[PDB]
Amino acid sequence: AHLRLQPIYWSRDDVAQWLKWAENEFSLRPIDSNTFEMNGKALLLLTKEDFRYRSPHSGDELYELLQHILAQPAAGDELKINAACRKVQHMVVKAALLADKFPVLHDIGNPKAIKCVPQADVEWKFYDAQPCSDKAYKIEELFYSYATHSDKFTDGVCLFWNCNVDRYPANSIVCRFDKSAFVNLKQLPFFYYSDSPCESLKSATCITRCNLGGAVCRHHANEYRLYLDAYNMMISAGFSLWVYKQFDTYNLWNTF
Ligand SMILES: Nc1ncnc2c1ncn2[C@@H]1O[C@H](CSCCCCNCc2cccc(-c3ccc(Cl)cc3)c2)[C@@H](O)[C@H]1O
Numbered sequence: 001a002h003l004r005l006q007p008i009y010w011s012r013d014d015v016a017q018w019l020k021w022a023e024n025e026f027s028l029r030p031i032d033s034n035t036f037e038m039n040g041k042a043l044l045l046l047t048k049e050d051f052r053y054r055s056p057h058s059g060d061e062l063y064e065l066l067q068h069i070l071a072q073p074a075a076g077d078e079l080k081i082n083a084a085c086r087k088v089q090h091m092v093v094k095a096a097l098l099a100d101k102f103p104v105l106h107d108i109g110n111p112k113a114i115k116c117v118p119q120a121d122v123e124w125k126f127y128d129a130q131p132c133s134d135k136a137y138k139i140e141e142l143f144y145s146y147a148t149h150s151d152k153f154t155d156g157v158c159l160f161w162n163c164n165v166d167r168y169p170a171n172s173i174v175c176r177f178d179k180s181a182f183v184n185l186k187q188l189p190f191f192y193y194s195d196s197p198c199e200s201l202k203s204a205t206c207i208t209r210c211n212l213g214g215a216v217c218r219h220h221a222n223e224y225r226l227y228l229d230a231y232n233m234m235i236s237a238g239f240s241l242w243v244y245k246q247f248d249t250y251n252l253w254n255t256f
């Protein structure tokens with residue numbers, strides 16, 4: 001299932017599993033798993049000749065295989081994408097509320113009145129153009145247009161998780177499925193934030209207590225890697241994340 005990502009997201013282990021899969025799918029002479037000691041990003045840099053030299057018995061086959069994979073990327077499993085999207089949503093909105101301590105959250109495009117951070121100290125308010133009739137009693141029926149509402153919802157923060165509107169207001173958190181709509185915002189770079197306790201990896205994007213000293217505990221390490229797999233699955237599927245321009249990860253480091 002890892003291979004259902006674009007090869008540019010493949011790890012060293014993924015490339016090796018790719019070999020094993022192809023050896024059985026195409027009945028190839030078996031190649032050593034370390035025939036391509038590299039990740040998919042490096043794999044996309046090699047020439048077909050490098051394939052022939054690294055595997056004289058099946059290198060050309062594998063190259064054209066990689067090319068057929070790039071020419072027709074595999075469709076994603078909807079349940080794994082829902083879960084990925086839900087995981088990133090909770091991560092990101094939780095961090096923003098902790099960084100900037102917004103008093104109100106305006107959730108625009110949420111027909112089910114479900115909080116993605118139920119434990120947060122904030123007033124949560126829901127809006128949707130077509131609310132679920134079983135949740136409309138606590139949802140404002142509203143079609144957001146920047147032209148009509150740019151003067152409203154100016155307190156706290158607005159959340160547009162896959163609610164594609166004409167233009168997002170400046171105090172927004174946005175997920176968008178595939179640039180004039182995003183002028184008030186900036187791209188959200190990757191980060192992982194956790195305040196769960198440490199229990200017994202190097203990267204500047206693992207915002208955890210154990211990484212203040214650079215010695216991330218085994219637990220947050222595993223949780224970081226799970227979160228990066230979910231994030232990659234979402235980005236690889238065509239989502240992008242946008243945020244209010246004052247978003248600052250150093251505010252999250254200050255929570256420790
Ligand atoms: N202009 C609008 N103003 C207000 N509401 C407006 C406006 N346009 C549209 N809507 C409403 O948004 C909504 C249009 S997506 C309806 C699903 C809920 C969106 N978020 C909740 C959520 C949570 C987790 C995952 C996902 C998710 C991830 C990937 C993909 Cl592929 C699809 C969904 C979504 C409907 O409720 C529309 O009636």
Ligand SMILES: [K+]
Pocket residue numbers: 149150151152153154169170171
């Ligand atoms: K606003």
Ligand SMILES: [Zn+2]
Pocket residue numbers: 197198199208209210211216217219220
């Ligand atoms: Zn830790």
